[PDB]
Amino acid sequence: INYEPTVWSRADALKVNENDPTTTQPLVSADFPVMSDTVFIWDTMPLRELDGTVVSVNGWSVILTLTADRHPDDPQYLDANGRYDIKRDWEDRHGRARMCYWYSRTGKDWIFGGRVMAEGVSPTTREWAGTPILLNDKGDIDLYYTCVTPGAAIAKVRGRIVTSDQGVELKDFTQVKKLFEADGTYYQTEAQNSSWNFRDPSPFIDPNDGKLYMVFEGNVAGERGSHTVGAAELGPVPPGHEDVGGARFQVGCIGLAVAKDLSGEEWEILPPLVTAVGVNDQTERPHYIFQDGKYYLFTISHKFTYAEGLTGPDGVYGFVGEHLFGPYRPMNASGLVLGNPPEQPFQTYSHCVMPNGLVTSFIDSVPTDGEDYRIGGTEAPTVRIVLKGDRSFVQEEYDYGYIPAMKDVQLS
Amino acid sequence: INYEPTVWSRADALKVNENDPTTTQPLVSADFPVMSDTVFIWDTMPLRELDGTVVSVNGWSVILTLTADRHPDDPQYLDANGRYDIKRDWEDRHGRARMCYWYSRTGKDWIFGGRVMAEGVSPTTREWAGTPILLNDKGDIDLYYTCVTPGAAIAKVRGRIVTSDQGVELKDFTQVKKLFEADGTYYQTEAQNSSWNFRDPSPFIDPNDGKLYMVFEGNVAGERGSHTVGAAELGPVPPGHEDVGGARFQVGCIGLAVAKDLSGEEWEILPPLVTAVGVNDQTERPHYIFQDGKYYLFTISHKFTYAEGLTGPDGVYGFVGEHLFGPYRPMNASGLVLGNPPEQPFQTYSHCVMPNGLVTSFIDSVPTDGEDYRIGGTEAPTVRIVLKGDRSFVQEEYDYGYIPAMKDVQLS
């Protein structure tokens, strides 16, 4: 394939509205419950099939989380006044990230299952995000995830789930295979940019051609600082908006790759599908919903990774089209699908939109009193969106961390 | 035809953003020039062909305006301090409205041509808006306009244009034929609502079937107060937005009619194309652009005719689709195409979007100093928009009242 990417332009991004009640995340209460007092969780990945369906197994719902320990009694986090520096502990989570699983009969009130992989199985100590796929009714699972530092590679590891009346166990995740890394012609490398982004596999079977593909976060290849913000990247901005400052340093994209067959053992990279040069450096955790004859491609991004001269909220953005290879259109004209409320701009992150319309996210920082705030590291209230053509609309909210099964699979 | 209308819902209208720089009219300077110190003008109607092309004749650009005299020395407008009450004179224009024409070799600096029709030719003293159509290269014109009070009827009157090196004359507009009025089953009548809207013919030849049609402003038929704001009219509003108050009293729609042949002597009304029940009472001066395989249907509306619980600016709104009979989608997700800036919310009105992308409007009220303001009754700066799929983007601004010809027609 040699398709041209869809450009999310600066003029599109000028339409972002942080004050639109149809695209704003409901406020999180400062009295939120926490799902564990021994671990933090953040990016959450429901067990699913390749067509997107979120599944239970023998009546058990299952989710994976990036996870790190809480250290409330560790001297390295106790300050000179003996106060626990929970902000520092929370910020240190990324370097200690490991994949854990949780299970529940109800889709909430999650029971901790522990590590997916034994320590030392992963080629990198950090285990960053991806997707767990239930392959069949024998309980075989492929976990697609990101190995980071040194380098960054999308990888997979095969294992299995077994259950009983007492709970769920994931086991036999012992051999990680790296699948691919940034190439330097389509996706930017560490050599081209020490802060390059390359991560977050989201595999699926295409509803039109029946092949196995994945989307992932990349950056547009090229030496940092060399990218052109030209007419296509600027788009039809209004008078006064022609100066882009240092916008060339923001080069996020959603990448695509195709498996050479349905085993997903070996992959070919394909050119970027959606590019945000001059607009935002991060289009993270891309994923699809396939509904009404359309491809809805969602991705999460941050207020602080926008280019100079633009502003937008942390939250989830989206692009829609009728063909896998595009062209796509920005959802709601600007691209924004669900943004945090400007009064609590960092309350939630890592929205995962599931085909039943429910969106899960985790709680990051919620203001309390004065300039004071509470750190979450726990699931936020799930909220439903509905999609109508190229637009979306937020609907009602559900319990903290509610991720119900769309289908139950009984093991053979 | 029995097609279902496209509904512009309350949830769509919740997306309106008065602060979007890609959809905001440039600010009008309080030092604007006035095109006449003897008449006010407002709604402006360029001479055009049925395919939308704005035309000059023998090198002369021609526009029609609704027009009323200025009365700066009339005792009825001089207050007890001898100050001229220009606000009252300006507000009294509607009851004195008459169709005048203007001409220019440059598309600006308009020369006054005087009345189109002699007094007493029109069945009603008020001559309200419509469209002047150049029928052929012999200089035959059909003027479609609105006869109001008593009642409201869409009407037409045939005449001709002749020119010389000295200027333009329109003449022989002597026999007005009323074409149709509100029926009571599709469009609301005076009996159903003393404030019913029915006006503003915009005729065109359909690019797909070659028939002559027109759009116009209507209201959805039914007794005032009886209309249902149900699930379709509310749309997928977010939590907290379910109460609609008195929204059932706002029932604007864009109507459509088809000529029984290309003479446009006799017409059949068709069901509403776009309805705004529970959203806005006024979808005025509807008109099309046909571009990129799509129908772009523009209409002007007011801040003050929105239903309870919604807010939006005076300006032009739009809907886009691939088929004359729909369904259509709201432009820019909310419907807003060009809104007045919230600092000058009443600076311009009656946007007419022409197929070269230029938009003409008139100046209404521009703030000066304190709670003080200046009344216009003259043309505003023309501004260009570009259309890209279901979105629009404001571009550069031009001189006051610049309405250049897209094509010149030499008379035979």
Residue numbers in the entry:
A (entry chain A), B (entry chain A): 20 to 431
Text lifted from the article:
Among them, levansucrases (sucrose: 2,6-β-d-fructan fructosyltransferase, EC 2.4.1.10) catalyze both sucrose hydrolysis, with the release of glucose and fructose, and levan synthesis. Levansucrase from Bacillus subtilis, Bacillus megaterium, Gluconacetobacter diazotrophicus, Erwinia amylovora, and Erwinia tasmaniensis was extensively purified, and their structure was described. ,− All of them display a single domain with a conserved five-bladed β-propeller topology. ,, Comparison of different levansucrases shows that the architecture of the central substrate-binding pocket is also conserved. In particular, the enzymatic mechanism of sucrose hydrolysis and levan synthesis involves the action of a catalytic triad including two aspartates, acting as a nucleophile and stabilizer, and a glutamate as a general acid/base catalyst. To gain insight into the binding mechanism, the X-ray crystal structures of the beta levansucrase isoform from P. syringae pv actinidiae (Psa) in its native form and in complex with TPIS were solved, confirming TPIS as a competitive inhibitor of levansucrases.
Although X-ray structures of glycosidases in complex with multivalent iminosugars are scarce in the literature − probably due to ligand flexibility, we succeeded in obtaining the crystal structure of Lscβ complexed with TPIS. The binding mode of the pyrrolidine iminosugar in TPIS reflected that previously described for the fructose moiety in the structure of levansucrase mutants of B. subtilis and Brenneria sp. in complex with sucrose. , This confirms that the pyrrolidine iminosugar moiety in TPIS mimics well the fructose moiety in sucrose. In agreement with the competitive mechanism highlighted by kinetic studies, a first binding site was observed at the active site. The hydroxyl groups of one iminosugar unit of TPIS establish hydrogen bonds with the peptide nitrogen of Ala148 and the side chains of catalytic residues Asp219 and Glu303. The endocyclic nitrogen of the same iminosugar unit forms a hydrogen bond with a water molecule that in turn is bound to His113, and a salt bridge with Asp62, considering the nitrogen protonated. The alkyl chain attached to the above-mentioned iminosugar endocyclic nitrogen forms Van der Waals contacts with Trp147, and the ethereal oxygen makes hydrogen bonds with Arg145 and Thr168. The electron density was absent for the remaining part of the tetravalent inhibitor, suggesting a certain degree of disorder relative to the other three iminosugar-ending tails of TPIS, which are likely to occupy multiple conformations. A second molecule of TPIS binds an alternative secondary binding site located at the interface between two different dimers inside the crystal lattice, approximately 30 Å far from the active site.
